[PDB]
Design a protein around this ligand. Structure first.
Ligand SMILES: NC(=O)c1ccc[n+]([C@@H]2O[C@H](COP(=O)([O-])OP(=O)(O)OC[C@H]3O[C@@H](n4cnc5c(N)ncnc54)[C@H](O)[C@@H]3O)[C@@H](O)[C@H]2O)c1
Ligand SMILES: NC(=O)c1ccc[n+]([C@@H]2O[C@H](COP(=O)([O-])OP(=O)(O)OC[C@H]3O[C@@H](n4cnc5c(N)ncnc54)[C@H](O)[C@@H]3O)[C@@H](O)[C@H]2O)c1
Ligand SMILES: NC(=O)c1ccc[n+]([C@@H]2O[C@H](COP(=O)([O-])OP(=O)(O)OC[C@H]3O[C@@H](n4cnc5c(N)ncnc54)[C@H](O)[C@@H]3O)[C@@H](O)[C@H]2O)c1
Ligand SMILES: NC(=O)c1ccc[n+]([C@@H]2O[C@H](COP(=O)([O-])OP(=O)(O)OC[C@H]3O[C@@H](n4cnc5c(N)ncnc54)[C@H](O)[C@@H]3O)[C@@H](O)[C@H]2O)c1
Ligand SMILES: Cc1c(CN(C)C(=O)/C=C/c2cnc3c(c2)CCC(=O)N3)c2ccccc2n1C
Ligand SMILES: Cc1c(CN(C)C(=O)/C=C/c2cnc3c(c2)CCC(=O)N3)c2ccccc2n1C
Ligand SMILES: Cc1c(CN(C)C(=O)/C=C/c2cnc3c(c2)CCC(=O)N3)c2ccccc2n1C
Ligand SMILES: Cc1c(CN(C)C(=O)/C=C/c2cnc3c(c2)CCC(=O)N3)c2ccccc2n1C
Lengths: 260, 260, 260, 260
């Protein structure tokens, strides 16, 4: 086996701009040879994502809308993919949302509507996309989602997104147990903090990143390319023994408890 | 400090019949001296629960309806409790629901509505009850919920309830981090399987229980009284250093991987 | 069942002075009614421990030497216990040692001799004491050891003691799986930091304790009495469904990743 | 970055025959371009390992004795490596031993000598080899050891090897925290069961493997090549954000609790 993704069609869900973790993943996968299908939420991202995809050195990308709020766009999107490419070999699920005011101060700033919205977008959407993709994954495949340490432990302010990530992380395991008999693997990458659009609203994020640079074993914060290169492994056949796993790409921060 | 719960008002949520784990908890807490407030869902359980409470040797129990589907009954119920007793010292949250057809065969038998219903009842309700109880917990307190190993690992058929338990387990941690500054602890008991009303629908449950008897370190399945006696510790001052914890009351089954 | 330890003979291993965690455990167990057998290492501790035991309100304690370096004293000690009391119902194992210069700076300051000494005293000794006690635990029983979060994650300077605690924690599980068929439970308490004789040599320990007071959910550092009161639960019949478990008595610190 | 190991000198410790997991790793690393240094224990393995290395398509391998019992051979071996190649970029540590009679029946079949031997060979040796290699790892590097699920949970008969693996797993974390500031990563692969020389003595191993084929998500047992291909990722720059991690290459078995 080898690391090449030539002849693999991979859906990358969640590019918003060039700082998106999904854009780090798309670059790594394209460099490995994959043909990419980008999905975006919101008509104003369409041109953005088309332009970023156009910087890739092959012009073979497909770009499609897919809001994951309910099933309707999911069905439209995956029908297009089925007609255009026939078979899907992977999905990178890079989607999260919660109401921003719930991600400041106490976790108890959430409420039922917000809690269920965060779980719908951040956790159920993986299952919804799996459901729509499964019958087109006829040649085996690999599904990767992104999680964060605040789904395992309390991270200040992460709040209802931590609870939704814990739901996502459990779903990765149950999906992996349903799909491995069809040679479909399901894993996550637990990325360290990265200054993306989804970092806007964190207080004193510069202090968080500085502390990671001091406390993490490798003495540096995570990049989208580190995350991308681990995702290229997970979509390749090199990782075929691995499913239901959560790989921390966080400079080792997960093994530490405090800064000396 | 001591194990007594004399002078503690504890709300026990989720008695349905004498096999309920919540009924094991209520017995242990009453024996330790607590005054109990029982809550029930559905008008047909009212007389049931009143009768079971009437078997306790003090006639000081309060029995109130509290469906946790939205906030409305929660607010009514906790207002009654505030007027009747003034201060709450504990809550035992023993509530779960998912659509039964999602808890057979593949996890992918769920759907958005079912997934969000399971999360609403089985996970958000703890937060909803916490929110309504917090201003009446003026003397410090202890909150205990019930979880199951299928929120940590794949258990056949547990499916969307495992994902909802993983959300519940994360919420226990974030609640504990919000409330410890008010001397309120939040913990779970991860009970081994018990033949309750919520076991109806498990296939070959007799085989599951027999396997636990063979594989568990202590060679026996869990009882509601084992769970109750651990919950009496968690509501007592003896456990005041413990919060955010998940105590397995499962005969040791959690430490095993297979039956020799 | 009840919390009483009347009629239970419990061996408490590792009192050195009144700050020892084992002394917090002995107090709680004596208050619950247990008859205690204290063991000490080193002839200079004999009078110390006799005097502390003499402050207990019943004068029924036995005090015996037991260095755990090899098996010889273990055998002498447990033979005395067998003749004096007949049956052992519990052991509190509160023993650790590593060379102090290995617990400063890098973990790589250890060496083979030091590593194996730390493992012998801090981890194998539990197995050695279990082996000598097992045939006198004819009425069921409960064994509790003390561990620390640095066996689960990196804690600065904890170094080879963290590795030895990880060995101890695994041994708790395998012991629990061997002994549950004889109604003997084996658990640990993972205590938060306490200023004991085994804290001498930690740098800036005042800063560590202050940070725990800020970061821990309950906003306070651990006491020996908190640890003692959880150990009284673990030796009582109230905890009979629990074995192979690690209970954190740390003010909730284990669920946090950083100080906001 | 890329997956190539051209220009990387990697020490592979623990080939015994063509079924060794280390031989799966060496093949994958050689295919990725690494120059390999094989180490073996026992003069009778010398010719074995030389012959297997001679099947590789470049004849650039070095083969050296390295018994890890004490430091002496380690020092000889690493001195040879330093003179022959100058810089080490990786180590694959594939070494374990315990007395076989301790790995049948109860864990309590161990004893002090056996316990400390298992820990010395199976856990401290990683630290000993790290210590000797560190000053030759001047260009950054990656260290991979092999662990097994029985270091996380009880696996029947794994016994003192499970305790020694738990010590190894903790050492991986503390090593990673010491060495990341020198751009050296330290990780493990937790392989599923493989019929190697170290499987001789397992009872009913055919039943264990059949059960894995039924219970594991991917419905198949692990191969040395699956393990090798994950180790090629860990030694490559693609995995540079990952340290202190334990990657399960076990067909997903780690996420399951029982066979339906
Ligand atoms: N930035 C971090 O520090 C970090 C660390 C670990 C994990 N993560 C996770 O990485 C993933 C990607 O986030 P990011 O940091 O790259 O930020 P981002 O804002 O670039 O990406 C989040 C994506 O989610 C999409 N999304 C939100 N609601 C959607 C909906 N209704 N339908 C479809 N798409 C929707 C957004 O359009 C956006 O493209 C998220 O799951 C996030 O939780 C982020
Ligand atoms: N039985 C087991 O094997 C087991 C093992 C571990 C944990 N648990 C958990 O224990 C808890 C109690 O379940 P049980 O096994 O005693 O069964 P049970 O059926 O007796 O109790 C479940 C309770 O949930 C209540 N509930 C359901 N929907 C509700 C709603 N909308 N509003 C308010 N209450 C609602 C029911 O009325 C019932 O009283 C649950 O959280 C369950 O997940 C059960
Ligand atoms: N102090 C903490 O912050 C803390 C936190 C968690 C766990 N622990 C653990 O609690 C336990 C008790 O330590 P402590 O903090 O009370 O300190 P302590 O120094 O009072 O107790 C340690 C005990 O170990 C005994 N011991 C050392 N070598 C021995 C040998 N060869 N034979 C027999 N006994 C031997 C000492 O005599 C002493 O009584 C230890 O396992 C320690 O790792 C301590
Ligand atoms: N086979 C499995 O099912 C399995 C599963 C997970 C992990 N592991 C681990 O994989 C590693 C490799 O074992 P394997 O299964 O390939 O079997 P193996 O017997 O082929 O390899 C074990 C190696 O350890 C070496 N070793 C033993 N004592 C030594 C000493 N004193 N000095 C130097 N080398 C010494 C042996 O010479 C042998 O080369 C071990 O750490 C084992 O625990 C094995
Ligand atoms: C690293 C990190 C993140 C980023 N992250 C891991 C996320 O999963 C972000 C999710 C997110 C989810 N929903 C959001 C936003 C961010 C901001 C914009 C918005 O409106 N809603 C984060 C987000 C909130 C609080 C703390 C946080 N930390 C410490
Ligand atoms: C022990 C166990 C349970 C019971 N349990 C732990 C639960 O949390 C049950 C939750 C539940 C949740 N919702 C349910 C029902 C049960 C049945 C009645 C119904 O209509 N909906 C369980 C439930 C489903 C599948 C497997 C299961 N196992 C192995
Ligand atoms: C809380 C804590 C402790 C204390 N502890 C948990 C221990 O297990 C101590 C073990 C110990 C073990 N061996 C030791 C000594 C202490 C000091 C005296 C000596 O000579 N050898 C500790 C010990 C060393 C480094 C950091 C530490 N932290 C953060
Ligand atoms: C998969 C597996 C293994 C193999 N393994 C993971 C190991 O780490 C083996 C270690 C080992 C360690 N020491 C050993 C031997 C094997 C056999 C030859 C000998 O003399 N001593 C194993 C080993 C013993 C018991 C159960 C076991 N299971 C279920």
């Amino acid at each position: 086996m080898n690391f090449s993704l030539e002849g693999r069609n991979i859906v990358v869900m969640g590019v918003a701009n060039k700082r998106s973790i999904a854009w780090g993943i798309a670059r790594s996968l394209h460099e490995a040879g994959a043909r990419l299908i980008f999905t975006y939420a919101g008509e104003r991202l369409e041109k953005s994502v088309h332009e970023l995809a156009g910087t890739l050195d092959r012009n073979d990308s497909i770009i499609l809308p897919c809001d994951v709020t309910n099933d309707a766009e999911i069905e439209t999107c995956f029908a297009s993919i089925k007609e255009q490419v026939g078979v899907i070999h992977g999905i990178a699920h890079c989607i999260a949302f919660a109401n921003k005011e719930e991600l400041v101060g106490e976790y108890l700033n959430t409420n039922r509507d917000g809690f269920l919205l965060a779980h719908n977008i951040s956790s159920y959407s993986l299952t919804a996309v799996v459901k729509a993709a499964r019958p087109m994954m006829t040649e085996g495949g690999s599904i990767v989602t992104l999680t964060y340490l605040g789904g395992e432990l309390v991270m200040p302010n992460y709040n209802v997104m931590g609870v939704a990530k814990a739901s996502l992380d459990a779903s990765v395991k149950y999906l992996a147990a349903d799909l491995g008999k069809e040679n479909i693997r399901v894993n996550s990458i637990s990325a360290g903090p990265i200054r993306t659009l989804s970092a806007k609203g964190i207080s004193d994020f510069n202090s968080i990143l500085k502390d990671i640079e001091e406390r993490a074993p490798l003495r540096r914060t995570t990049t989208p390319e580190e995350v991308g290169d681990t995702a290229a492994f997970l979509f390749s056949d090199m990782s075929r023994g691995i499913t239901g796993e959560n790989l921390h790409v966080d400079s080792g921060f997960h093994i530490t408890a405090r800064l000396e």
